[PDB]
Amino acid sequence: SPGIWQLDCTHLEGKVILVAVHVASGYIEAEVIPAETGQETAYFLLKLAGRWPVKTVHTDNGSNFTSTTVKAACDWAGIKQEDESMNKELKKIIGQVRDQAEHLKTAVQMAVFIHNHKRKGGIGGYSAGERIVDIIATDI
Amino acid sequence: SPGIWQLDCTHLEGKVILVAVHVASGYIEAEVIPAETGQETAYFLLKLAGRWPVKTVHTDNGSNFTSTTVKAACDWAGIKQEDGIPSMNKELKKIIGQVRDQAEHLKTAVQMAVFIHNHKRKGGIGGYSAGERIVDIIATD
Ligand SMILES: Cc1onc(-c2ccccc2)c1C(=O)O
DSSP: OTTEEEEEEEEETTEEEEEEEETTTTEEEEEEESSOOHHHHHHHHHHHHHHSOOOEEEOOOOGGGGSHHHHHHHHHHTOEEEOOHHHHHHHHHHHHHGGGSSSHHHHHHHHHHHHHHOOOSSTTOOOHHHHHHHHHHHHO | OTTEEEEEEEEETTEEEEEEEETTTOOEEEEEESSOOHHHHHHHHHHHHHHSOOOEEEEOOOHHHHSHHHHHHHHHHTOEEEETOOOHHHHHHHHHHHHGGGOSSHHHHHHHHHHHHHHOEESSTTOEEHHHHHHHHHOOO
16 A cells, blocks of 8 residues: 555664655665654654655654654644564665765665665566555556 | 756755756755765765666766765766756745745755645646656656
């Protein structure tokens, strides 16, 4: 179902990685923020919804999700809030490349790239990035 | 032509907005950044290439694109950087004006403007938004 996302946090090197996964494709958007604040959550949600058709986000039940700024952002963007493997593996990929860049946020974006472009299976398979565009274009 | 994006910058309230426009559809991605440095630009392009299949980037050849760090990122990501190959900015700045008094900070209003731009139906009730066009242009199957 095309508008469904899951949003999770990962700590690492004492920073926070916000990860949104498109549930039906496995396609990932992620960013590193100083701290898991209401402000940063709202900002990330607004960004995600202006880039993809986001109907429903499933979250952990942290306090960042129920701030007034998050609620105003979700209200404005038409996002409905609700209450894992693609997250273990982003961490894995991050380990595979941690040592190609100085900074953690570069590594994180390299991992998102590698994840989203990686063909699954043999000749005839699709990457996550292909699945999401395909699912949305079919829906339209 | 589906893998081509045009990068431009626009300046507001003393801040820097970096804009990437998918030329065939008009879809945009945009971020407020501190200043147009080699690292911020390389970071922006790596985010973009991780999210859409970017073949080619046309730039304004600003000094941030001659940075060694940008070239290394484009090489890493497999992007052909085309410098100096010739206005979303005007449109975006006007959408920003319509939402500016809803956001405590410019950065928020920029993302609200990107949301409205990508969702806006173009060319009548039988139209399509930039968002629909891009997925339609990019989808392979
Ligand atoms: C309807 C519909 O279906 N998909 C999109 C869309 C929106 C933003 C990005 C990509 C697709 C969209 C829209 O509201 O423009």
